[PDB]
Design a binder for these strands. Structure first.
Lengths: 98, 226, 297, 119
RNA sequence: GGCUCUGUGGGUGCUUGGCCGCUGGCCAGACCUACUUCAAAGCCACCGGGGGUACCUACCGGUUGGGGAAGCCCUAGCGGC
RNA sequence: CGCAAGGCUGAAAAAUUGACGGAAGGGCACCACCAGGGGUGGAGCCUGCGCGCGCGCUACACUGACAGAGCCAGCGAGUACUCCCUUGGCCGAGAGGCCCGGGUAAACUCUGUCGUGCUGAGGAAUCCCUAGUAAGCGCAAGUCAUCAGCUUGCGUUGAUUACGUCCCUGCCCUUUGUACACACCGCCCGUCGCUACUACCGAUAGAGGAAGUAGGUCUCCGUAGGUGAACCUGCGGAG
């Protein structure tokens, strides 16, 4: 029985895949290969709420929309969708009588 | 498991022994498992009914391979025989008894004649051609066999190594190398070494599959993949 | 495969015997740990054992872990407790009747992951063989008298215990009309057990609550709408199967959806359904003097 | 042992060490570290060797006959024939040690039981 | 005529000589014992686990009595720091 | 032994996390569709459940009756097992024992003899069933609960038709999470609560009512000082 799986993280850079290749006089890839930057566009930049602007929000689509230009109906619907995700996870006698 | 999801889809079951060879069909419809319960299974997973048709064999299944045009499958057992089954109507259509065609042996530390050594008489791995007309078969032995899947004959046999520094490359060892203390390629000669890191034996007693000690003097000949 | 089942059952029985001897020693070692922390003087037969102190220095930590409950006891259920969904098949006797087959369907529908199998001509060792060959967690056999069921046999696999029980007061699902009943919801049921206090009661509680798939523990206290109740009086465990809506924060409307039993267990054997020669753990002692006075579970 | 008794890495490596030794069949229990004090033993390794474990499984009669039979090469462990009489058989390969394919010892057992199938 | 046992030779890896104090000799051998300037660079080097340490040994730091390579200086000496 | 052990009393909330839905898209199901099969329900018997209801059992003819021939199982061994009760007689002083009367399969295969003859296979509904499964058949046991009005095993013979689809009836789940590459998708919708703030209404600064928003290195030279030959620092010049 091998071992219990314990979490291990590996730090990859933004270098091309011919930096992960082994040492040899020339690459095995062509000229098109060798520009693939070993981290996807989702790791180069992903639009999210932690990297958004102050006035704006980002949607689920990855599009900045501002709270000022958003209408009341869309504000209510966005509040409902976030709430749906959260759900998924002795006095006086005159004062008495009168 | 699923690749795009990451979590475990299922544990299929119905085998009475450890499952030795798996093969998905090249069109994508049928898994075939082969296991040491002397059995194989045509698993149909992707349909709405998940079903398992057994193929009962004569000994432990060692290898499973598909034809590229997926109507045929060859499964190689522990007797040394290849059986060519059909996958649509699960009937054996062909068969080769291939013990003699692959039996080439007599390692050092082997007190049997090379004809009587069992263990180097089976096909551990088999692959169809990209044409689909010729199997290629290799086991724990010196010979690679290339069978025809229609005419059922051995088209060509190959020898992997002439190298006598490996252990099982000739079936008749000569009696010049047999002293009165066993064979001459068996006496521990580590003590006649000038360097300490060559003299030290950090080996574990009884470790067939690898140890970092790894004496590895006269390793066996085996074709582990084709 | 069969050699592995036999070898693992023999290893389990040997480990249980070693646990008996080690418990006889570890009742003495827990006095030495409590006297070390609190300073009360202990017995000389405990304090003058050099082997006990020399081995106590290594075996502190499992006693501390058992005190904190960080480890679980060596059991046939603790290997796969909340990891695998326990699959379970329900079968009849050999030539069932129509009401026994409809009752088999009803108590299949009681478990959300169960399957039902037609017996027909199926020899009982091959039934056990096919269960171990398809890695079933539980089998449940049914016995009828004349269209009314009289016995269950709940057997845990690969080598686990049988609980054989006799059924009384069975009111079937198949007696009420389809206008009043309906298709039973198959959600993962809550379970409640009421009145089990002896270690034998916790044994039968374990072999009854490991028949059901494990509930997702994120919001299980409020979600889920289906409950199954095992409550015993006079060691005859009575079971109901309800479905509920929470009509307010203070009130709840129940609706009886499944069959009613009062099963009484009469045999708990440490060994599967095929082993008639397995060592029993408990059996209903009739024809003794005070076997009717004494209440187990 | 020398770690403090309420330590997390002590408890985790106790369970790992006991599970590893019980899976290799050296210890007979996995609930005491005094087993690794005075029960792990070169005799326990040497009785987890192959001719003694097939003496216990009654594949042979005695360890001398078992060493002779696995030097002549009748015994496979799993799917591979074993010629080394020092191959340490673990607890889950004791369910897979059996005779080889064309074994005369297997023909002798089948001829005794009168099930000698010549096919 | 047959079985068994034993012995010798060849083969069981691709064919370039027997020996020596080997660029030359010898297989019948021959000659016998010379010649010499300056001991050495360091490191590593596998004994099963826990424990004891009186004695021996290893390592480190010292103590008495002798010993003086080398470094420094100059009243030049059998010198001095 | 001390405390518990003194009745503004007289039966039938939480929430920035909550309450209920809808639409779209999936997955599954002989409690669904589809194709077939089989019960029950008609007559009689009876356990059981509350005269009624089903569950078993039996009878109901082409798949016939009679006579032959041949050929097949598996589970089953506690000095232990027996179906009654009686008319007579024996030996019985008496209790009894005797004798004689009365109430290892089925199936299957083959060969002949006769020929539909109170000698009639179950309505509406409702339920179940997908491979050694439905259905037929016998043999054995009787295991501390249940079971002789039966129960549970065990062998034998062994099909038709589905093995697709969510269209109907439903059940479960997505619309949050749980992993990253390719690749794809692209802010699901409603009625209210709760909280914060803002102003309003009117009785006595105030509890309510109603509403809205969220860039000079190296070397040399001339200097001036430093601890003086030299040498160091600072500056001014040339290479």
């Amino acid at each position: 029985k091998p071992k219990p799986p314990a979490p291990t993280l590996t730090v990859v850079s933004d270098v091309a895949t011919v930096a992960m290749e082994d040492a040899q006089p020339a690459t095995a890839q062509g000229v098109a290969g060798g520009e693939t930057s070993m981290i996807a566009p989702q790791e180069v930049y992903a639009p999210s709420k932690d990297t958004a602007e102050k006035g704006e929000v980002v949607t689920k689509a990855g599009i900045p929309i501002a709270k000022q230009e958003m209408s009341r109906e869309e504000k209510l619907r966005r509040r409902r969708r976030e709430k749906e995700r959260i759900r998924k996870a002795v006095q006086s006698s005159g004062a008495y009588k009168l | 498991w699923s690749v795009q999801t990451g979590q475990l889809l299922d544990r299929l079951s119905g085998h009475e022994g450890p499952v030795s060879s798996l093969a998905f069909a090249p069109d994508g419809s049928v898994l075939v498992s082969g296991s040491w319960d002397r059995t194989a299974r045509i698993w149909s997973i992707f349909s709405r009914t998940q079903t398992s048709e057994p193929l009962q064999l004569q000994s432990d299944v060692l290898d499973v391979a598909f034809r590229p045009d997926s109507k045929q499958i060859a499964i190689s057992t522990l007797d040394g025989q290849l059986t060519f089954w059909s996958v649509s109507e699960a009937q054996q259509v062909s068969g080769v008894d291939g013990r003699r065609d692959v039996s080439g042996g007599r390692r050092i530390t082997d007190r049997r004649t090379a004809a009587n050594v069992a263990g180097t008489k089976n096909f551990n791995t088999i692959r169809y051609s990209m044409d689909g007309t010729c199997l290629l078969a290799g086991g724990n032995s010196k010979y690679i066999c290339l069978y025809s899947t229609t005419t059922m004959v051995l088209l060509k046999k190959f020898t992997v190594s002439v190298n006598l520094s490996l252990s099982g490359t000739q079936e008749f060892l000569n009696s010049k190398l047999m002293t009165e203390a066993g064979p001459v390629g068996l006496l521990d000669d580590q003590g006649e070494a000038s360097d300490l890191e060559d003299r030290i034996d950090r080996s574990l007693p009884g470790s067939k599959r690898g140890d970092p000690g790894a004496r590895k003097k006269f390793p066996e000949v085996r074709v582990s993949g084709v | 495969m069969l050699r592995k089942q036999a070898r693992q059952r023999r290893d389990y029985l040997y480990r249980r015997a070693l646990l008996l001897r080690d418990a006889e020693i570890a009742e003495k070692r827990a006095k030495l740990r409590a006297a070390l922390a609190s300073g009360k003087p202990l017995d000389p037969k405990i304090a003058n054992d050099k082997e006990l102190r020399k081995d106590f220095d290594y075996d502190v930590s499992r006693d501390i872990a058992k005190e904190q409950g960080e480890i679980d006891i060596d059991d046939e259920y603790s290997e796969l407790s909340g990891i695998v969904d326990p699959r379970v098949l329900v079968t009849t006797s050999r030539d069932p009747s129509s009401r026994l087959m409809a009752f088999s369907k009803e108590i299949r529908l009681m478990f959300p992951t169960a399957i039902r199998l037609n017996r027909g001509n199926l020899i009982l060792p091959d039934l056990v063989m096919s269960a171990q060959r398809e890695r079933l967690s539980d089998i449940i056999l049914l016995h009828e008298h004349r269209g009314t069921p009289t016995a269950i046999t709940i057997s845990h696999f690969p080598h686990g215990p049988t609980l054989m029980a006799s059924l009384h007061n069975v009111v079937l699902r198949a007696d009420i009309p389809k206008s009043i009943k309906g298709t039973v919801s198959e959600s993962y049921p809550h379970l409640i057990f009421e009145g089990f206090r002896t270690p034998l009661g916790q044994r039968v509680v374990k072999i009854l609550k490991h028949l059901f798939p494990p509930r997702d523990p994120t919001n299980n206290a409020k979600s889920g709408n289906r409950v199954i109740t095992f409550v015993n009086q006079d060691d005859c465990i009575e079971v109901r199967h309800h479905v509920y809506v929470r009509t307010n924060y203070n009130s709840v409307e129940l609706s009886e959806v499944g069959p009613r039993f009062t099963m009484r267990p009469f045999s708990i054997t440490m060994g599967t359904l095929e082993n008639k020669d397995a060592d029993v753990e408990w059996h209903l002692s009739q024809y003794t003097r005070t076997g009717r006075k004494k209440n187990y579970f | 042992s020398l770690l403090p008794p309420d330590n997390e890495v002590r408890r985790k490596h106790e369970t790992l060490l006991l599970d590893k030794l019980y899976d290799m069949g050296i210890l007979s229990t996995k609930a005491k570290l005094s087993a690794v004090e005075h029960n792990v033993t070169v005799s326990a390794f040497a009785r987890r060797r192959l001719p003694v474990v097939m003496t216990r499984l009654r594949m042979a009669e005695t360890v001398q006959a078992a060493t002779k039979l696995i030097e002549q090469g009748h015994v496979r462990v799993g799917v591979e024939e074993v010629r080394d009489p020092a191959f340490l058989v673990t607890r889950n390969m004791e369910d897979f040690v059996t005779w080889t394919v064309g074994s005369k010892i297997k023909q002798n057992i089948m001829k005794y039981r009168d099930k000698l199938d010549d096919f």
